[PDB]
Amino acid sequence: PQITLWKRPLVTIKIGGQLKEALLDTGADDTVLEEMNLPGRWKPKMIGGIGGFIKVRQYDQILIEICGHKAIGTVLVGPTPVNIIGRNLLTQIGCTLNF
Amino acid sequence: PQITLWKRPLVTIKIGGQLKEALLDTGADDTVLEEMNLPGRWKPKMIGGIGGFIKVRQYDQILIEICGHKAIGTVLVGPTPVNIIGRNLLTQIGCTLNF
């Protein structure tokens, strides 16, 4: 689809078999989701945003469906203000900016 | 043009007679630029992201040229680590997400 930006570009995602809403965020290098339970091993990591740095749980090679497009990659879980899909998965679903 | 997301979507902008590099950021509601001494009146504001909030100065009706496309609207100025073009101006240059 083509998505205009008059409103936040929120889409439904499916991860761990559960549905959620997430923001397509071209300014995010990485995908960061709010606190949730995900199976498999995870490594503690840090990521920085406009307000400073936070501690997150890094899950590698995670299956995640974004607006009907499948991705498999790194998902960070932690106290982000909102669920964001970053460039590491936006590239996988073929997302581009166009103007 | 079409911008892929393999790397950060950085482009040249022109504001207050200065050229700068800025991130085209669909995750940012509003444009926030690194510290610069703009003229005119302003209002204090707090914007939040990963890590918490920062204090910024809100200027209204500021002209920004983004890749030769002219836009005018709210521009926040403060201690952001990166120049960020948010949705308030991305809409004005016809920018969309596509996959």
Ligand SMILES: CCOP(=O)(COc1ccc(C[C@H](NC(=O)O[C@H]2CO[C@H]3OCC[C@H]32)[C@H](O)CN(CC(CC)CC)S(=O)(=O)c2ccc(N)cc2)cc1)OCC
């Ligand atoms: C310590 C920093 O290190 P740096 O290298 C790069 O810092 C940054 C790089 C990009 C961004 C931009 C930010 N990206 C981000 O948080 O992404 C993080 C996860 O992915 C990696 O990749 C980049 C960082 C992490 C979002 O796109 C936009 N935000 C909102 C979003 C939705 C609520 C927040 C999830 S907002 O808060 O900024 C914002 C809020 C209101 C506004 N009116 C305007 C902006 C901020 C800082 O610079 C120092 C050398």
